[PDB]
Amino acid sequence: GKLQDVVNQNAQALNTLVKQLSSNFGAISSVLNDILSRLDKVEAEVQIDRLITGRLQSLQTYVTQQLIRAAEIRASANLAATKMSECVLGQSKRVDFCG
Amino acid sequence: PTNGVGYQPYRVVVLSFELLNAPATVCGPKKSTNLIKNKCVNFNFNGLTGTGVLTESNKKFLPFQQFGRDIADTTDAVRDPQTLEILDITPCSFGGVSVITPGTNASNQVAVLYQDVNCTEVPVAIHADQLTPTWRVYSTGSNVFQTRAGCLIGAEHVNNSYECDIPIGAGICASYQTSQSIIAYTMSL
Amino acid sequence: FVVRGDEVRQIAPGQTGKIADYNYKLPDDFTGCVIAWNSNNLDSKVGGNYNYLYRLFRKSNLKPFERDISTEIYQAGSTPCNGVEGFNCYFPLKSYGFHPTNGVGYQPYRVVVLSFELLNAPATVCGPKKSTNLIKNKCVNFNFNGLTGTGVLTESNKKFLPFQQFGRDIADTTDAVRDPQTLEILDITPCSFGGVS
Amino acid sequence: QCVNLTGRATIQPSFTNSSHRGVYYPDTIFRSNSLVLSQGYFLPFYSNISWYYALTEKRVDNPILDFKDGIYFAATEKSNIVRGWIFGTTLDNTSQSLLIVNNATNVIIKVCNFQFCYDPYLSGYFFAVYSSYANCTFEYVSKPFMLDISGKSGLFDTLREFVFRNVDGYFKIYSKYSPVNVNSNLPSGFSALEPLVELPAGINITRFRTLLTIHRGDPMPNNGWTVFSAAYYVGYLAPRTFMLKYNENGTITDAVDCSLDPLSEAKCTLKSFTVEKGIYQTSNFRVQPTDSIVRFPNITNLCPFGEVFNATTFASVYAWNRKRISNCVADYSVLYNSTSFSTFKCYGVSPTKLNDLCFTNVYADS
Ligand SMILES: *[C@@H]1O[C@H](CO)[C@@H](O[C@@H]2O[C@H](CO)[C@@H](O)[C@H](O)[C@H]2NC(C)=O)[C@H](O)[C@H]1NC(C)=O
Ligand SMILES: *[C@@H]1O[C@H](CO)[C@@H](O)[C@H](O)[C@H]1NC(C)=O
Ligand SMILES: *[C@@H]1O[C@H](CO)[C@@H](O)[C@H](O)[C@H]1NC(C)=O
Ligand SMILES: *[C@@H]1O[C@H](CO)[C@@H](O)[C@H](O)[C@H]1NC(C)=O
Ligand SMILES: *[C@@H]1O[C@H](CO)[C@@H](O)[C@H](O)[C@H]1NC(C)=O
Ligand SMILES: *[C@@H]1O[C@H](CO)[C@@H](O)[C@H](O)[C@H]1NC(C)=O
Ligand SMILES: *[C@@H]1O[C@H](CO)[C@@H](O)[C@H](O)[C@H]1NC(C)=O
Ligand SMILES: *[C@@H]1O[C@H](CO)[C@@H](O)[C@H](O)[C@H]1NC(C)=O
Ligand SMILES: *[C@@H]1O[C@H](CO)[C@@H](O)[C@H](O)[C@H]1NC(C)=O
Ligand SMILES: *[C@@H]1O[C@H](CO)[C@@H](O)[C@H](O)[C@H]1NC(C)=O
Ligand SMILES: *[C@@H]1O[C@H](CO)[C@@H](O)[C@H](O)[C@H]1NC(C)=O
Ligand SMILES: *[C@@H]1O[C@H](CO)[C@@H](O)[C@H](O)[C@H]1NC(C)=O
Ligand SMILES: *[C@@H]1O[C@H](CO)[C@@H](O)[C@H](O)[C@H]1NC(C)=O
After folding, report:
1. Phi, psi dihedrals of residue D69, rounded to the nearest 5°
2. DSSP state of B129
3. Which helix (H) or strand (E) holds D306?
4. Which runs of consecutive H residues, i.e. helices, occur in chain A?
5. How does DSSP classify residue D351?
């Protein structure tokens, strides 16, 4: 599970990023085609701006969470490299470091 | 008949539309055209304008249905209002293309990695018929090398193994060697 | 131009109708002003002022700011009818029926549409504001050719092009301006000095 | 008067490419020292230019060509043979056209109703392009150009590049001049066409024709159609996304097509002209739609607007009528003949987008 949820933390983020495409964000609809087929240029712009702002905020949120998780994974990988160097490649006198 | 315009009679007609997922009952005066498939076009079915490529498929729509969505609330498929045929909409763009290059002041030569594709169906995944010929030389050729990360066109594959400069993925790397050309190889551990 | 009253609301971007489809269409990104006033007892006389024409039929919608002065016979049926009037093919232009006793919806109106540009070009038309005296090295609100900004003005030399009024920077702020009266290239520096502790 | 020329060799257009030429200014913003991604109708790099020339053999090239979304017209010559342009949609007295013709000192620009004769040509001495102009508004004369029929020998020395566009009722002309020495071929390199003039022609332009001069002269009693070494190049603008570099003077020093090769499109997403060694993911720029498909249900019944509107009596407002409108076609153009609408407001849809929509359950209160 200590590995598995990591995968379950990465597939769930992309799925939520896809499912956030079906959001109005205050616009009339969540579909660019509906807005561009029902409204003219001057009046669909205020709806497309809402959709663009919402989806850009969604992408920024996803990237921020990915950066947080990448920092945590990098800390774990640094620990794993230290374990490999100090216990596989040698013998460690540190208590409870390796077993 | 001699009263002021503020008290003259007026006739008001108020029209109400619904625009549902139902067969179209009233339409605009815009006349139809001839359907073309497997080509990046702007379509307009029942007053639903979109952009993409159209393929014949069978998604088994309900009889009182016109379009089918997906989990991203995009038009996954539409029904032809004249031939009663269930078409299929695929996005024109192919995000998932990588350009592998040396420095700009080294060569104007690039290799193109197409991700998770099988190299025979590259021209129908890129739509190479609608591209400029400078793209169409990069879709097919004799430099096609199939990797586990899609496949790579524009870099010859050698059986030797070196330490690698440009990592491509799935163990495949690329470099700019010797006239001068881009080579791809399995990375040497 | 001259339209009837009921079509005065059609002079607007995004509108549709008879004037906005066959006669005069405003672009969707219009930057201007539309003025219209009642012109009865000036554009209409007794017995009918049949001098103003409007296009009733056209083969296609008009693109913005496009004039269709042609007068070819419009075909509305099946036969080409060899370019004469009669059945299923009509004259495209029709005369207005302005009368002094007509209703307000049928009274003649006069419409003037002004189009503005506001470019980085020398100013051609100005407002009625009176100019003031330029002061330098002091935090002021400045209005150069309609550029209402705030800052300090310093004499400099950035060598503007002859057909230039202001020069930007990488942050799209007004880095420098040309004086409209002395043709002297000033320099705007922000009034505040964030960077103090 | 107009004389239809005989003996002329058939119009055989050769072909060449637009190697990095035709870059113009898409808008008047005056940006300086900036890389800008701009979508607009641009001439693609290495595009298929069709090429015509005047060589006396004994052929002049004044054909009639399609004006689609603006054109790029590059002319190379010795003695200023290209001396005008015809624009319009029918090129007759039934429609309004545009003439740009320059004699020895200045230009003449007239948006009028010329009855252009078949095979028009300019008569050069030491004219016969139209027959009558009437019922027109615009007239422009104030623009200089160099014209002299002299020194008719040697390899070409002048290259004049033009970009013609007709948007928002404005005819935009962009121009550039460059001295080159070539052998009957377009020189390669970069071209930045500065904005020249902006006509309020406000006319429908779909099909154009160039103008060449003729030298009948005195020393040819046989009506000698001796023309001189000149060659022009036409390319068609397409909706692309260029990357433009503006220097301190506001001039486009360099541009990137972004739809040409993978190097340009990977050069277009990284927002730099020099990419470094590595592998880059790339946004989409390569493929653009060309055709438009409209498909509506096969119903042809005109909608009863003669009963919903123009009835003998309507219902009173306290007992307002309800009528279901069904199996119609919704064109409001049939009501322009008789009724002028005082108010026409629409909520949820736009009035100009009604003709491209299909509804399901239209109801009509009255
Ligand atoms: C402008 O001129 C053209 C000349 O061809 C007019 O005719 C249409 O041109 C388009 C060009 O693609 C054709 O597809 C149509 O079939 C033509 N005929 C029509 C619409 O009846 C065109 O109508 C003129 N006006 C505009 C606004 O384009
Ligand atoms: C409508 O027209 C198409 C072709 O234009 C034809 O195939 C079809 O049978 C017609 N009738 C319908 C869809 O009811
Ligand atoms: C796809 O690639 C596989 C190789 O793993 C190959 O066997 C197969 O024939 C390809 N599919 C085609 C060519 O349709
Ligand atoms: C490289 O290896 C492949 C693997 O079978 C082989 O078919 C090919 O002939 C080799 N090329 C050489 C040795 O040049
Ligand atoms: C306008 O007035 C200013 C002073 O008020 C004067 O210096 C200038 O010469 C005048 N003319 C122009 C063209 O600026
Ligand atoms: C060329 O002009 C002459 C003028 O007399 C005319 O008779 C002839 O019909 C014209 N050519 C064509 C193809 O119309
Ligand atoms: C473009 O034209 C030049 C000369 O006109 C030619 O050498 C070249 O092969 C052409 N094609 C390209 C650059 O694809
Ligand atoms: C340009 O178009 C002509 C039209 O027939 C064609 O023959 C020619 O091959 C085209 N040029 C290129 C480089 O594709
Ligand atoms: C020739 O140029 C003069 C100005 O030099 C101009 O007034 C005249 O209209 C032009 N005539 C023609 C036929 O172009
Ligand atoms: C052109 O203007 C004259 C001037 O009176 C007018 O009589 C005529 O109807 C107009 N139209 C045409 C097509 O001649
Ligand atoms: C800008 O233009 C001026 C005058 O046209 C010229 O002297 C200067 O060299 C130009 N700047 C650059 C960088 O070319
Ligand atoms: C309304 O319809 C009648 C016929 O029912 C027709 O005579 C009349 O011209 C129409 N238009 C009106 C009253 O504006
Ligand atoms: C347009 O309205 C006039 C009004 O009298 C009428 O005579 C004419 O027949 C109408 N044209 C149509 C309905 O096409």
Report:
1. 60, 30
2. G
3. helix D305-308
4. 4-19, 32-38, 41-83
5. G
Contact, C10 vs C18, CB < 8 A? yes
- Hey, what are D227's tokens? 């023309």
Q: Are D48 and D234 in contact (CB under 8 A)?
A: no
Resolution (A): 3.3
Q: Give φ, ψ of B33 to 5 degrees.
A: -125, -170
The number of angstroms, rounded, from the C-alpha of D196 to the middle of its chain's C-alpha atoms is: 15
A73 — phi, psi (to 5°)?
A: -65, -35
Structure tokens at A18: 């896809």
* Secondary structure of residue B156 in the 3-state scheme: strand
Distance from Cα B134 to the centre of ligand 8, integer Å: 14
D46 in contact with B, Cβ within 8 Å: yes
CA pair distance D89, D66, nearest whole angstrom: 9
Amino acid at D347: Y
Q: Which residue in this structure is represented by tokens 């080509």? A: B39
Separation CA C155–CA C179 (nearest Å):
10
The total of other beta-carbon atoms located within 10 Å of residue B25's CB is 18
- Give kind and range of the element (H or E) at residue D263: helix D262-269
Between CA D39 and CA D268 the distance in angstroms is 12
Breaks (C-N over 2.5 A) in chain B follow: 178
Q: How far apart are CA A90 and CA A98, in angstroms?
A: 11
Q: Which residues contact A50 (CB under 8 A, 6 or more apart)?
A: A25, A26, A27
Helices A41-83 and A4-19 pack at an angle, to 10 degrees, of 170
**Helix, strand or coil, per DSSP, at residue A65:** helix
Q: Rounded to whole angstroms, how far apart are CA atoms C193 and D241?
A: 40
Q: Which of residues 76-105 of D touch C (CB under 8 A)?
A: 94-96
Separation in Å, CA of A43 to nearest CA in chain D: 8
> Is the separation of the CB atoms in B51 and D291 below 8 Å?
no
CB B81 within 8 A of CB B43: no
**Please, what sign has the CA dihedral across residues A10, A21, A55, B46?**
positive
Is D183 at the interface with chain B, CB within 8 A? no
Classify each residue of B94-115 as buried b or exposed e, where b means 16 or more C-beta atoms within 10 Å of its C-beta: beebbbbbbeeeeeebbbbbbe
Q: Is residue D15 within 6 Å of ligand 8 at its C-beta? A: yes
Q: What token pair was written down for B50?
A: 């979109």
Concatenate the DSSP letters of all residues of C96-161 into one string.
--B-TT--GGGSEEEEEEEE----SS---S--SPPP-----SS-EEEEETTEEEEEEEEE------
State which of D92, D135, D136 you would mutate to test the pocket of ligand 10, scoring each by most atoms of that ligand within 8 A of its C-beta: D135
Q: How many CB pairs under 8 A join A and D?
A: 17
**Cβ-based neighbours of C197, under 8 Å, separated by 6 or more:** none
Query: Do you know the residue count of chain C?
Result: 197
Beta-carbon separation of A43 and C29 below 8 A: no
Helices then strands, counting H and E runs in chain C, come out as: 0, 12
Find out whether the beta carbon of D340 lies less than 6 Å from any atom of ligand 13. Answer: no
Cβ–Cβ below 8 Å for B71 and A22: yes
CB neighbours of C132 closer than 8 A, spacing ≥ 6? none
CA angle in degrees (0–180, nearest 5) for C22-C89-D113? 55
Collect all residues of chain B within an 8 Å Cβ-Cβ radius of residue C104.
Answer: 5
What values do phi and psi take at A43, rounded to 5? -105, -25
Give how far Cα C152 sits from Cα of B44, C22, C158, C182, C186, Å.
Answer: 56, 53, 16, 18, 10
Retrieve residue C56's tokens.
């009733």
- Within 6 Å (CB) of ligand 12, which residues are found? D 310, 338
Cα separation, C73 vs C158, whole angstroms: 61
